[PDB]
mmCIF file of C-alpha atoms in Angstrom:
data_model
loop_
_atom_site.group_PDB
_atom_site.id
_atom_site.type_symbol
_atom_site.label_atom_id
_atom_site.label_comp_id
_atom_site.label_asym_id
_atom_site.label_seq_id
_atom_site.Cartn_x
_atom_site.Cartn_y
_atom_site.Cartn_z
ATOM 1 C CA UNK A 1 84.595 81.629 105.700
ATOM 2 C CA UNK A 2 84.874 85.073 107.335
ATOM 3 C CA UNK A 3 88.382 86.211 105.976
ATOM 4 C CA UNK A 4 87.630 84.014 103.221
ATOM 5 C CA UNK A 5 85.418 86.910 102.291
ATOM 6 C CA UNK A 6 88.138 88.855 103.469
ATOM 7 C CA UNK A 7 90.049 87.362 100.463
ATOM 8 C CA UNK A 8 87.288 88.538 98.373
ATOM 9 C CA UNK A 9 87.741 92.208 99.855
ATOM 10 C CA UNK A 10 91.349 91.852 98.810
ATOM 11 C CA UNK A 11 92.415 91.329 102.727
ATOM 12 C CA UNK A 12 96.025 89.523 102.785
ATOM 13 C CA UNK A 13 96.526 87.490 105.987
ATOM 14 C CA UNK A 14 99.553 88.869 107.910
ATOM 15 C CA UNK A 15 101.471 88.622 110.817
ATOM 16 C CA UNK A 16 101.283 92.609 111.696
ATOM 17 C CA UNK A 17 98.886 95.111 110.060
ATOM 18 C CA UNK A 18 101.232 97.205 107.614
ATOM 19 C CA UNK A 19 100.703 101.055 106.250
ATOM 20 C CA UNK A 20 97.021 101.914 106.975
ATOM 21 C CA UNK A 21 96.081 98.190 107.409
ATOM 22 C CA UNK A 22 93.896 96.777 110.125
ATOM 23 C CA UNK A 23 92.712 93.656 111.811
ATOM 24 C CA UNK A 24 89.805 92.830 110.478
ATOM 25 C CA UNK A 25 89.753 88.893 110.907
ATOM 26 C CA UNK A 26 91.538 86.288 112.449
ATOM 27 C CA UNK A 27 93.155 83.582 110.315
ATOM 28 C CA UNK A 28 94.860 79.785 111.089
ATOM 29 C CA UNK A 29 98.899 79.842 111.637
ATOM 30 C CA UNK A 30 98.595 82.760 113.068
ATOM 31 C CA UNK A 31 98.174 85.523 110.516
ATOM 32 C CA UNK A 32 95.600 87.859 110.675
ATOM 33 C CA UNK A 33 93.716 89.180 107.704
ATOM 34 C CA UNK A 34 94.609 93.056 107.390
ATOM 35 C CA UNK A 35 93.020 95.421 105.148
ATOM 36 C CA UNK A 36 95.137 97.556 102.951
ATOM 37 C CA UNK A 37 92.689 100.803 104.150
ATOM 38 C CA UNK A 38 92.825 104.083 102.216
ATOM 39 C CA UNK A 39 93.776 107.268 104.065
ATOM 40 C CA UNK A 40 92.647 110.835 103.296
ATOM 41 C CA UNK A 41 88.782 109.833 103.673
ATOM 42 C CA UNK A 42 87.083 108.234 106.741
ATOM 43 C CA UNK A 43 88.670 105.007 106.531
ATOM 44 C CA UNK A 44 86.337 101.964 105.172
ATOM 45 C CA UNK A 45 83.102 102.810 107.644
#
């Protein structure tokens, strides 16, 4: 349910957080749903 609405926010469950991308929730198998964040403004909050 909670990176399910991750999903919904666009966040792809990986391994390790990639280019700007941060844990946000924790997923089965492992992975780790990690937002794609934009730079240049104050993140997401």
């Amino acid at each position: 349910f909670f990176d399910e609405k991750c999903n919904k926010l666009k966040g792809t469950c990986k391994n390790n957080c990639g280019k700007n991308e941060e844990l946000i929730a924790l997923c089965q198998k492992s992975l780790k749903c990690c937002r794609t964040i934009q730079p240049s403004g104050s993140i997401i909050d």
